[PDB]
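cache lookup: miss for this entity combination. No prior model stored, computing from scratch. Input as submitted by user K.M.:
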Amino acid sequence: DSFVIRGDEVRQIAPGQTGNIADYNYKLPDDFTGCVIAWNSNNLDSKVG
Amino acid sequence: ASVYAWNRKRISNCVADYSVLYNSASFSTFKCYGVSPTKLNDLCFTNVYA
Amino acid sequence: SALGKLQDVVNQNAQALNTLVKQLSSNFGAISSVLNDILSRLDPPEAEV
Protein backbone atom coordinates (compact mmCIF):
# COMPACT_ATOMS: atom_id res chain seq x y z
CA ASP A 1 0.00 0.00 0.00
CA SER A 2 1.87 3.04 -1.33
CA PHE A 3 1.32 6.69 -0.38
CA VAL A 4 3.32 9.87 0.19
CA ILE A 5 3.04 11.80 3.47
CA ARG A 6 5.06 14.27 5.54
CA GLY A 7 8.22 13.36 7.41
CA ASP A 8 6.79 13.58 10.93
CA GLU A 9 3.60 11.64 10.15
CA VAL A 10 5.33 8.28 9.58
CA ARG A 11 5.08 7.53 13.33
CA GLN A 12 1.28 7.33 12.90
CA ILE A 13 1.66 4.30 10.58
CA ALA A 14 1.22 1.69 13.31
CA PRO A 15 -1.68 -0.26 14.88
CA GLY A 16 -3.96 1.69 17.21
CA GLN A 17 -2.41 5.11 16.63
CA THR A 18 -4.02 8.54 16.90
CA GLY A 19 -3.38 11.24 14.34
CA ASN A 20 -4.74 13.27 11.45
CA ILE A 21 -3.98 11.04 8.45
CA ALA A 22 -4.36 8.02 10.77
CA ASP A 23 -8.05 8.72 11.47
CA TYR A 24 -9.01 10.45 8.20
CA ASN A 25 -6.75 9.03 5.45
CA TYR A 26 -5.22 5.64 6.30
CA LYS A 27 -5.90 3.47 9.36
CA LEU A 28 -4.09 0.23 10.27
CA PRO A 29 -5.75 -2.75 11.99
CA ASP A 30 -4.79 -3.54 15.58
CA ASP A 31 -3.74 -7.10 14.63
CA PHE A 32 -1.58 -5.87 11.71
CA THR A 33 1.14 -8.30 10.63
CA GLY A 34 3.94 -7.26 8.29
CA CYS A 35 6.36 -4.39 7.71
CA VAL A 36 6.32 -0.69 6.84
CA ILE A 37 8.75 1.14 4.55
CA ALA A 38 9.89 4.77 4.69
CA TRP A 39 12.61 6.82 3.00
CA ASN A 40 13.20 10.50 2.28
CA SER A 41 12.07 11.59 -1.19
CA ASN A 42 12.47 15.38 -1.11
CA ASN A 43 14.67 15.48 -4.23
CA LEU A 44 11.85 14.10 -6.43
CA ASP A 45 8.53 15.02 -4.76
CA SER A 46 9.19 18.74 -4.27
CA LYS A 47 9.44 21.89 -6.39
CA VAL A 48 10.64 25.47 -5.96
CA GLY A 49 7.17 26.89 -6.62
CA ALA B 1 7.44 29.94 32.52
CA SER B 2 10.77 28.21 33.07
CA VAL B 3 10.91 24.46 33.61
CA TYR B 4 12.53 24.85 37.05
CA ALA B 5 9.57 27.05 38.11
CA TRP B 6 6.80 25.55 35.96
CA ASN B 7 3.45 27.31 36.21
CA ARG B 8 0.52 25.28 37.53
CA LYS B 9 -2.82 26.44 36.09
CA ARG B 10 -5.91 24.86 37.62
CA ILE B 11 -8.85 24.06 35.33
CA SER B 12 -12.29 23.71 36.93
CA ASN B 13 -15.95 24.69 36.40
CA CYS B 14 -15.78 24.60 32.61
CA VAL B 15 -16.89 22.44 29.68
CA ALA B 16 -13.87 21.28 27.68
CA ASP B 17 -14.17 20.25 24.03
CA TYR B 18 -10.92 18.42 23.25
CA SER B 19 -11.80 18.25 19.53
CA VAL B 20 -10.23 21.70 18.94
CA LEU B 21 -7.02 20.25 20.41
CA TYR B 22 -7.21 16.96 18.49
CA ASN B 23 -8.10 18.63 15.16
CA SER B 24 -5.15 21.04 15.52
CA ALA B 25 -2.24 19.97 13.31
CA SER B 26 0.23 22.53 14.71
CA PHE B 27 1.18 20.11 17.51
CA SER B 28 4.33 18.17 16.64
CA THR B 29 3.64 15.49 19.28
CA PHE B 30 0.21 14.42 20.57
CA LYS B 31 0.45 11.66 23.17
CA CYS B 32 -1.69 10.48 26.09
CA TYR B 33 -0.67 7.89 28.68
CA GLY B 34 -3.59 6.89 30.92
CA VAL B 35 -6.51 7.91 28.69
CA SER B 36 -7.63 7.64 25.07
CA PRO B 37 -7.52 10.98 23.18
CA THR B 38 -10.82 10.31 21.38
CA LYS B 39 -12.58 9.29 24.62
CA LEU B 40 -11.68 12.57 26.38
CA ASN B 41 -14.98 14.15 25.24
CA ASP B 42 -16.96 11.52 27.21
CA LEU B 43 -15.34 11.71 30.67
CA CYS B 44 -15.69 13.92 33.74
CA PHE B 45 -12.62 15.13 35.63
CA THR B 46 -11.34 17.57 38.20
CA ASN B 47 -7.85 18.41 39.60
CA VAL B 48 -6.77 19.44 36.10
CA TYR B 49 -3.43 21.26 36.19
CA ALA B 50 -1.64 22.45 33.05
CA SER C 1 -21.22 -23.97 70.64
CA ALA C 2 -23.06 -27.30 70.38
CA LEU C 3 -23.79 -26.79 66.66
CA GLY C 4 -20.25 -25.69 65.86
CA LYS C 5 -19.62 -28.03 62.92
CA LEU C 6 -22.62 -26.93 60.82
CA GLN C 7 -21.94 -23.30 61.74
CA ASP C 8 -18.31 -23.82 60.67
CA VAL C 9 -19.45 -25.21 57.30
CA VAL C 10 -21.80 -22.23 56.80
CA ASN C 11 -19.13 -19.72 57.89
CA GLN C 12 -16.43 -21.18 55.62
CA ASN C 13 -18.77 -21.24 52.60
CA ALA C 14 -20.06 -17.69 53.21
CA GLN C 15 -16.54 -16.39 53.92
CA ALA C 16 -15.14 -17.99 50.74
CA LEU C 17 -18.02 -16.45 48.76
CA ASN C 18 -17.35 -13.04 50.34
CA THR C 19 -13.62 -13.25 49.60
CA LEU C 20 -14.41 -14.19 45.98
CA VAL C 21 -16.75 -11.19 45.73
CA LYS C 22 -14.18 -8.85 47.33
CA GLN C 23 -11.53 -9.96 44.81
CA LEU C 24 -13.44 -8.04 42.10
CA SER C 25 -12.27 -4.78 43.74
CA SER C 26 -8.57 -5.48 43.11
CA ASN C 27 -7.00 -4.05 39.97
CA PHE C 28 -4.23 -6.74 39.78
CA GLY C 29 -1.72 -4.19 38.51
CA ALA C 30 -4.12 -2.50 36.10
CA ILE C 31 -5.19 1.15 36.31
CA SER C 32 -8.62 0.27 37.73
CA SER C 33 -10.63 -2.65 39.06
CA VAL C 34 -13.74 -1.55 37.11
CA LEU C 35 -13.90 -2.80 33.53
CA ASN C 36 -16.28 -0.01 32.47
CA ASP C 37 -13.70 2.65 33.38
CA ILE C 38 -10.99 0.86 31.37
CA LEU C 39 -13.33 0.52 28.37
CA SER C 40 -14.44 4.16 28.51
CA ARG C 41 -10.92 5.52 29.14
CA LEU C 42 -8.48 3.74 26.82
CA ASP C 43 -7.84 2.89 23.20
CA PRO C 44 -8.16 -0.87 22.34
CA PRO C 45 -4.38 -1.73 22.10
CA GLU C 46 -3.89 -0.68 25.74
CA ALA C 47 -7.40 -1.66 26.86
CA GLU C 48 -6.50 -5.24 25.87
CA VAL C 49 -3.46 -5.14 28.18
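stored under new cache key. The interface with chain B takes residues 31, 40-43 of chain C (CB under 8 Å).
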